[PDB]
Amino acid sequence: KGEDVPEPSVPESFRVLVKELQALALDVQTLDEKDNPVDIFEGLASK
């Protein structure tokens, strides 16, 4: 395009290590400044 580059969103390694951690029965959740839930999965987590 001639744009800068789309770094952010979430890192691969991170979502992959969340789910790969979830495959053993570990509840690994992500928190805000104040200890709050945070949807790492790009609005795709919804059922």
């Binding site: 789910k19 495959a23 029965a25």
Partner: protein
Amino acid sequence: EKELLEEMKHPSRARRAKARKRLEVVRAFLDSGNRPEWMILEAVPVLPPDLRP
């Protein structure tokens, strides 16, 4: 917890070592920790497919 408290301090030495170590895990659970019944499985998560393609 209380049982272990007494088990820890009151019996003489050479014993309460393991009561200490046991206490650690009990405290761990009752801290910002969870309920120990999930320590065993009856639901198994399946890893996505492309991660095991």
